[PDB]
Structure 1
């Protein structure tokens, strides 16, 4: 992407060793980040040292967007390297100058936000929907470890139709295909016809 390269060439590129902390909750927000490689966890820590993960962000995602539109904000949360990371940084002021010169870089930042909203809104429904989603996920992990599963470079590959999944967990063909699609979008599987690759099953 030329609009991205052109953006990058105005940024300071920083390398974060894995599990180092890029952002501390409470600090003044002045920098926009973009992830060149690697991945991060957005998280919250209580006073006892218990964590909750709010979000994972990966290559292509920005971090800090809201701070671009609301000057003088504190960091809402910590951000931690989930793997070694390369991360491009630019000040909010400088990014605001790039915007005036090239409205495209803001469309890139906005699209990236829209796709994150779309992907997470595929999971949303009521408690019966979460229940059926969980039972599908659990079926896919079980199948991944049965003797008919095949070793695949990304995980384990299995063969099963939407109809059979629906009979195992009790829902329609349609509700199954909706949930496998939410799962691919979460990058937890890839699916083509009846071939499903379940990622990360060793």
Structure 2
């Protein structure tokens, strides 16, 4: 059992959100503070060219819209929507601040993840971003070449890591540093001399 969680939730209101239903709409005045008891949700924005862009998926046990607890008035840059029928608890920010006085443990939890949530995004300057822009261009251009292969996901090209570095003007390593990053962004794919560009 979980002494705190159970206490915490006895101060929250749990409701169900059928898939695709929206939990928080975008310029809403933040005052909660949502805790996912079960199921998953998505954080969406619209980029230039008004396409839905997924910022993150949040799963059971995670919290929703902190960033509004430490920023009065703060709105909701990007709005929360359910992906699967899920139960979510929500508590007045005002009342939550009271819980923290009583037993500052829950605060520890939420405080948590984030951290485990940051320890995953980071370990990542101007000089660096420049090369990242150049390499992305090289791959973008090669996909439009007549010698490009057609891939179910997009276009597949042929080039060595050293060739990328020679073209852009960087070490073979810097290429791997960037290729790995781009690959983690689900934008490209690297295996030997074969590289595939998505979209």
| TM-score class normalised by the smaller sequence | 0.5 to 0.7
SS in 1 for 2:26: coil
Q: Shift in Å at residue 48 of structure 1?
A: 6.0
Q: Shift in Å at residue 45 of structure 1?
A: 2.4
Closer/same/farther in 2, CA of residues 47 and 180 from structure 1, 3 Å limit: closer
Higher strand share: 1
Name the residue aligned to 1:44: 45
**Count of residues in Structure 1 that have an aligned counterpart in Structure 2:** 198
Higher alpha-carbon deviation: 93-102 or 172-181:
172-181
Distance 1:32 1:10 in 2: 12
Contact kept in structure 2, 1:43 and 1:54, CA below 8 Å: yes
Closer/same/farther in 2, CA of residues 11 and 47 from structure 1, 3 Å limit: same
Higher helix share: 1
* TM-score normalised by the chain length of structure 1: 0.60
Q: Shift in Å at residue 136 of structure 1?
A: 18
Higher alpha-carbon deviation: 137-146 or 91-100:
137-146
Closer/same/farther in 2, CA of residues 67 and 190 from structure 1, 3 Å limit: same
Superimposed CA distance per residue, residues 111-158 of structure 1 (whole angstroms, 9 cap, x where no aligned partner): 1211111123367xx999999999999999999999999999999999
SS in 2 for 1:79: strand
**Which consecutive unaligned segments of at least 5 residues does structure 2 have?**
none
* TM-score normalised by the chain length of structure 2: 0.61
Distance 1:176 1:56 in 2: 29
* Structure 1 runs of 4+ with >2 Å offset: 45-49, 119-123, 126-200
Closer/same/farther in 2, CA of residues 180 and 49 from structure 1, 3 Å limit: closer
